RNA sequence: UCGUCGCAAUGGUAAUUCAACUUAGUACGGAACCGUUGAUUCAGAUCAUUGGUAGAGCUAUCAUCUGCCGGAUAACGGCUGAGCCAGAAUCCGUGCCAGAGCGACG
RNA sequence: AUGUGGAACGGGGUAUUGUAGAUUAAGCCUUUGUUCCCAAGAUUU
């Protein structure tokens, strides 16, 4: 149940686990920003 | 369709349409287990398997408890192969009987004068030569030997005191070997735990759980994963590798509508058709499956003994 | 070395090459073959988070393995890890130490947002100063920096003297 | 072998049984039972909840 | 006559597809056999856990489990020179579901 | 259809809600507890 927020663990398939990370939705930064990428493994 | 049309099984026991393919090379044994669908528990099974996605993942899934332990093995029944089908050549049980078996053979045991196999027991005991002659004829004529086996309905905790007789054919063994095994198991209590450990995929069968205005239909759970034998008499029924501590398979304070099985259960990881205390028909697979997943055993790490009725999390 | 590994290169992320360790199946075996013999390639799984250069950084001695590793996984890693291989449980902000801390004996530079406790954990236990720094803007240094004693870090397992890269690691 | 302790009920939450109030930050406020699960969802203080162990501790 | 345990004439029938990894960056820019891990649809079950319903019960492709191998073949390719072999998600069986005629036993 | 006889309760356990209490198996368990009654008649072979 990807509900703990922040697809599979980390993967979003265009979810953090289970967890749903954040969703860009209509255009909101939350999902789109993804902590501004970079950082861990998105560098 | 396959299961269609829907029809509830009139017989409480899940009469098996087929049985595992007997072979005289294999030792004379059985291929059935008289379960009773006690209950269920989240027996967390650590699936230690490299390559698998759920590697060492504790599978907290329903271990469908089915009371199955020492079942009265009365005798054997001959079965000769005929051009018109399989015909029962003879049916020679043991001299010793049981009240539960007699209650099963009748409908008003207490009202009845307990005449069930009255002279038959005397004939079996006194005229042992006639029993031996019939047994010799069975060994020389019958193609298959259906080892008669009742249940422990009166022995184990249950309102029904009618022993569920089952014509469990001797799975494997020669004619002499099957007769010798039947003679050894004459008037004995065939234990389902002794027959199988219920630690892998099984071929459990039996009627479903009667819902109401359906269910109770004879089914056969193919590749029914069995977690472990839920020995209700032993305090360690739900005790596992990580849980341990003599955990009881029944929920804390008794399972819902089934309490604590007086004897061993057949707790199976997954589903099992049948309600609480509804007699199951666990059996061996007719065919053979050498799949790696079936061969690889999931290590039962933890289990669930929570007082589900109520505080569904209070294990103690 | 651009070690061929499935589809994603991610050799460093999967295997956080430490100073005297490599924190590592063919690619892990390849890391165990070359790097593992000298720098022990401990096959880190971290309870399914097999990526070491994403969670488990640190120079060999007290390598800052993520505390997110399960109790069995952490104990198995710690028991297998010797004194010069010890897997220090990174429980601070660098819980993604492998990506966060830029594992390297000289300096195990931690993520810019990594806590000082995680910074000191690699600094003291791993004998490799985890300076909290964002490698080329990316907060988690170990992912961006293929740190060595002498996302590049995610895509290249940089041991004390080695820099083994991934399948299709950008040249 | 330690299991998550109930935030609502102050007693080790059973595996799967009970509930953990996992918010967006994955607070995972564990609960000893279904009653504590409602308390966990409301983030009820274990000291406040008499059934919870922390109330006895307090 | 009652009751128990069985036989099986016959009727129905069920599984389906895809992805990834290993093969293999190999054979010859780039496969395929096998194997492995999972998902889609469908079917049959169950309520240990979770959600819903006002603890229980019910229930959720909102939860979990399970879902095969033999023969004979078509196209087609071979053997001797018709008679055989190989050969399909096809067909008939194994298995599963129902049990009209019957068996053994008290 | 004269004894684990069953049926009932008295319950205990069990939990719920809930702030400990009551329900307390009802498709939660279970009872060294209690009393009641018992082919008792009727009916067909």
Give a nutshell description of this structure.
Chain A has 43 residues and is low in regular secondary structure. Chain A has one helix and no strands.
Q: How does this model look, in words?
A:
- This is part of a larger assembly, with chains A (43 residues), B (316 residues), C (171 residues) and D (58 residues).
- Chain A is largely without helices or strands and 43 residues long.
- Chain A is built from one helix and no strands.
- Chain B is an alpha+beta fold and 316 residues long.
- Chain B has helices at 99-105, 118-125, 128-141, 175-184, 192-195, 292-295, and strands spanning 32-33, 42-47, 57-64, 70-73, 76-82, 85-87, 91-92, 144-149, 166-169, 188-191, 201-202, 205-207, 218-220, 224-225, 268-269, 282-283, 299-300.
- In chain B, the strands form six sheets. In chain B, strands 5, 6, 7, 8 and 9 form a five-stranded antiparallel beta sheet that branches. Chain B has a four-stranded antiparallel beta sheet with strand order 15-3-2-17, with no helix packed on it. Chain B has a two-stranded antiparallel sheet with strand order 1-16.
- Chain D is an alpha+beta fold.
- The A-C interface holds A 9, 38-43 and C 10, 13, 48, 51, 54, 96, 99-100, 111, 134-140, 143-144, 151-154.
- Chain B binds two RNA strands through β3, β5, β6, β7 and α1.
Cα gyration radius of chain D (Å): 10 Å
Strand content of chain D: 5-15%
Distance between the termini of chain C: 11 Å
Share of helical residues of chain D: 10-25%
What structural category arises from helix and sheet content of chain D? Answer: alpha+beta
Number of domains of chain C: 1
Strand content of chain C: under 5%
The value of Rg of chain C in angstroms is: 13 Å
Q: Care to count the β-strands of chain D? A: 2
In whole angstroms, how far apart are the ends of chain D? 27 Å
Q: What is the total tally of β strands of chain C?
A: 0
Number of helical regions of chain D? 2
Biggest beta-sheet profile of chain D: 2 strands, antiparallel
Order of helices and strands of chain D: EEHH
The largest inter-chain interface, given as chain pair and residues per side, is: A-C, 7 and 22 residues
Spatial order of the strands forming the largest sheet of chain D: 1-2
- The helical percent of chain C reads 25-40%
Individual helix count of chain C: 8
- Shape descriptor of chain C: globular
The largest pleated sheet of chain C is described as: none
Overall morphology of chain D:
globular
PDB class: ribosome
Keywords: 60S Ribosome, nucleophosmin, ribosome biogenesis, fkbp, ribosome
Entry title: Ytm1 associated 60S nascent ribosome State 1B
Chain A: 60S ribosomal protein L23-A
Q: Which features does this protein show?
A:
part of a larger assembly, 4 chains, A: 43 residues, little secondary structure, 1 helix, 12% helix, C: 171 residues, mainly alpha, 8 helices, RNA-binding, ribosome
